[PDB]
């Protein structure tokens, strides 16, 4: 019958993306695709078999509209009146990694497997990374004609 | 007020074709 990956089956890879003025949505959808594993033919939703992702120049992310300063990230401690919010600009100039992370985390399942996937997501505010000893494959986001 | 209106306005969707039960 149909094929189901066993234990000694997975083959991993470390991909690396540039965020040089890429659109956040494109970038995040691509990363979600890769991490969840919708690009290999061995896909199975019960298994995590995607690929590690390394994002760089994440402080170069540039969005459209007034979303830099009219858009409001929110949180809530749980206490009363403990709703506190932030723009996107403030949040870049505080820590840029979180914008791209949360953007991607909303493009994944919020289940156990999703939590076990977020482990496979590494993001760095600069161009660099300590993960050169995996020789990361550059990914260039492309669109297939039909 | 709000609740009734949002009901009566969710009805104008596309998969309902302009109508819903109990408005």
């Amino acid at each position: 019958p149909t094929y189901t990956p066993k234990a000694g089956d997975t083959t991993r890879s470390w991909y690396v993306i540039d965020a040089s003025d890429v659109v956040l949505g494109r970038l995040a959808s691509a990363a979600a695709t890769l991490l969840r594993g919708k690009h290999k033919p061995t896909f199975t939703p019960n298994v995590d078999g995607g690929d590690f992702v390394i994002v760089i120049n994440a402080d170069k992310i540039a969005v459209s509209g007034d979303k830099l300063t009219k858009k409001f990230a929110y949180r809530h401690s749980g206490y009363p009146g403990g709703l506190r919010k932030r723009t996107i600009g403030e949040l870049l100039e505080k820590h840029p990694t979180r914008v791209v992370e949360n953007a991607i985390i909303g493009m994944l399942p919020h289940n156990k497997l999703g939590r076990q996937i977020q482990k496979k997501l590494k993001v760095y505010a600069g161009p660099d990374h300590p993960h050169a000893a995996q020789q990361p494959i550059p990914f260039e986001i492309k669109q297939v004609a039909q | 007020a709000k609740r009734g209106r949002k009901k009566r306005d969710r009805k104008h969707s596309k998969a309902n074709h302009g109508k819903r039960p109990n408005a």
Binding site: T2, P41, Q146 | -
Partner: protein, 124 residues
């Protein structure tokens, strides 16, 4: 004339409670609680028997599409092409090919490339 009722009940009790070895709590000990869960259980089995078809077909399609897109063609146009070419292979088996032998699948991809219309968005 008086008919004690013991046997005639014990029968179905034994049946049910044999069929609920794996349930967790009062669903695994007690007839009035396992009967209910048997109703729900057989029903959910029925429904899943009707729907695992769509489940597997979804799976097969995701595999096919990812394989193709790594060979730089979309799913929709692949199936347009095979329909045009009269090729008969179903999706379970296209997926099996994708897993095992990507070469043959790439050959089929190439067939569809050949057999598609020239101007796909034409008004024909």
């Amino acid at each position: 004339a008086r008919v004690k009722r013991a046997l005639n009940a014990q029968k179905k009790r034994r049946t049910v409670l044999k069929a609920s070895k794996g349930y967790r709590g009062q669903r695994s000990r007690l007839y009035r609680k396992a009967k209910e869960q048997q109703l729900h259980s057989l029903t959910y089995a029925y429904r899943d028997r009707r729907a695992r078809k769509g489940e597997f077909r979804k799976l097969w399609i995701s595999r096919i599409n990812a394989a193709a897109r790594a060979n730089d063609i979309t799913y929709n146009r692949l199936i347009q092409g095979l329909k045009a070419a009269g090729v008969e292979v179903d999706r379970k088996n296209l997926a099996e090919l994708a897993v095992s032998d990507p070469a043959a699948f790439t050959a089929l991809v190439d067939v569809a490339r050949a057999a598609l219309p020239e101007d796909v968005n034409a008004p024909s």
